C-alpha cells in the first residue's frame, strides 16, 4: 500500500508500511485516505492513527509539527511526539490538571498565547489516550 | 648521564603513561554518549531531508530563493572544530580540505565567507587569513542547537539579503568506531534528487495557510537539522580520534621507559665499577 514515517525531532516515532491514517491539521482534525492530494503544511496539537496490513492500528500523540501528505512514502515532522503506550491516561489527566489550573492562572493575551498551547497539548493527549483503547 | 636525574625522568614518564591510559578511558566513555546522541538525531534529519527531496520534484510548484540554482559570486562555509587538543590531526585534515576547495574558488574569483563552531577553527583561520564572519566556541560536553542557531542565523541572513549564493557544511563522518573522514557538502541551495512528481495522496495542506511563509519556516528547520547532525557526528569523531591518540602516546611512553631503563642500568654499573676501581687502586 503505502509507507509512513514519524519523528519527534529527538526520537523516531514510526517507520513502516501502512494502509490508511487519520490525523490533525492546520485548523482541526481531518479524515485522511491514500491517493487524494499533492501539497503540505503545518499541524495543530493532535494525534494520528496507523492502520497497517491485516488491519492493525496504533495511536500516537502529536504535540506539533508539519505533514507531507503528497508522497507515496509520507512522514510527519513533529517538534514533540510520544508513543501511544509511552504516554498513558494518567499522564493525559495530569495534563488536564495542569491546563485547568493554567486557564485559571492566565490573565493576559501575552501569557494566554502559551496557556492556550498548553491546553491544546493536554486536549490532544486526552483524545489520543481514548483512541488508544481501540 | 647521571643516576638521580635519569631516575627522575623515568618516574615522570611512568606517571605520564599512566595518565594517558586514564585519558583513553575518559575518551571511550564520552564516545559512547556521543554515538547514542547521534543515533537519536539521525531519524529527524533523515526524514526532513526526505521531505525536501520529494519537494525537489513536485507539481503545482512555485519559486523560493533556497530552491533555485542561482549563480555563484561568493561561497559560505559552516566549519566545525574542537576547542581542545590531543585529538590527533582531525581538525588539521578538515581545515586542509576546506582550504583546497576555497583555493579552487579563489582561482575562479569567488570569495569565501566562513562561520566557525570551534575555537581551533577560529584561531587557524584568523591567523591564516580566512574571512570569519561568524563564530561560537566552548559548546560543552552536551551540545545544543540553541546556541548554534546564532551563527546559522547570520549565515542565513547573508544568503537571504542576496550576498551569499552557495553554502556548504564541512564535518567529519563517523564512518566506524575506528575510522572517519573529512567531508564538504552542499547545504542551502537544494541538491539533486532522483524522482518525478507524485500527483496525489490525501490533502494539499499547502493553501490552508500561506504556502510561501510555511515553506520558509520548513526550510529554516531543514538547515538547522542538517547543522545539528553534523555537529553531533563531529563530536563523536573527536572522541574516537582522541582515544586513538592516547593509545599511541601510551605505547610511546612505554617505549621510552624500556630504553631509559637500559641507560640507567649501564650508568649504575659503570659508576659502581669506577668507584670500586678508585678504592682498590687507592689502597696502594
Automatic annotation (TrEMBL), chain A:
Assembly and oligomerization: F-type ATPases have 2 components, CF(1) - the catalytic core - and CF(0) - the membrane proton channel. CF(1) has five subunits: alpha(3), beta(3), gamma(1), delta(1), epsilon(1). CF(0) has three main subunits: a, b and c.
Pfam family, one: ATP-synt_DE_N
Record organism: Escherichia coli O145:NM
Protein name: ATP synthase epsilon chain
Domain annotation ATP synthase F1 complex delta/epsilon subunit N-terminal: ranges: 3-81
Family: Belongs to the ATPase epsilon chain family.
Entry GO terms, CC: plasma membrane; proton-transporting ATP synthase complex
GO molecular function, one term: proton-transporting ATP synthase activity, rotational mechanism
Keyword list, A-Z: ATP synthesis, Cell membrane, CF(1), Hydrogen ion transport, Ion transport, Membrane, Transport
Role: Produces ATP from ADP in the presence of a proton gradient across the membrane.
UniProt keyword RNA-binding, yes or no: no
Residues spanning the membrane: none
Automatic annotation (TrEMBL), chain B:
Domain of life: Bacteria
Keyword terms: ATP synthesis, Cell membrane, CF(1), Hydrogen ion transport, Hydrolase, Ion transport, Membrane, Transport
GO biological process, one term: proton motive force-driven plasma membrane ATP synthesis
Cellular compartments annotated: Cell inner membrane; Cell membrane
One GO molecular-function entry: proton-transporting ATP synthase activity, rotational mechanism
One GO cellular component, as annotated: plasma membrane
Subunit record text: F-type ATPases have 2 components, CF(1) - the catalytic core - and CF(0) - the membrane proton channel. CF(1) has five subunits: alpha(3), beta(3), gamma(1), delta(1), epsilon(1). CF(0) has three main subunits: a, b and c.
PANTHER family hit by this protein: ATP SYNTHASE GAMMA CHAIN, ATP SYNTHASE SUBUNIT GAMMA, MITOCHONDRIAL
Family assignment from sequence similarity: Belongs to the ATPase gamma chain family.
Role this protein plays: Produces ATP from ADP in the presence of a proton gradient across the membrane. The gamma chain is believed to be important in regulating ATPase activity and the flow of protons through the CF(0) complex.
Protein known as: ATP synthase gamma chain
Source species: Escherichia coli
Organism taxonomic ancestry: Bacteria, Pseudomonadati, Pseudomonadota, Gammaproteobacteria, Enterobacterales
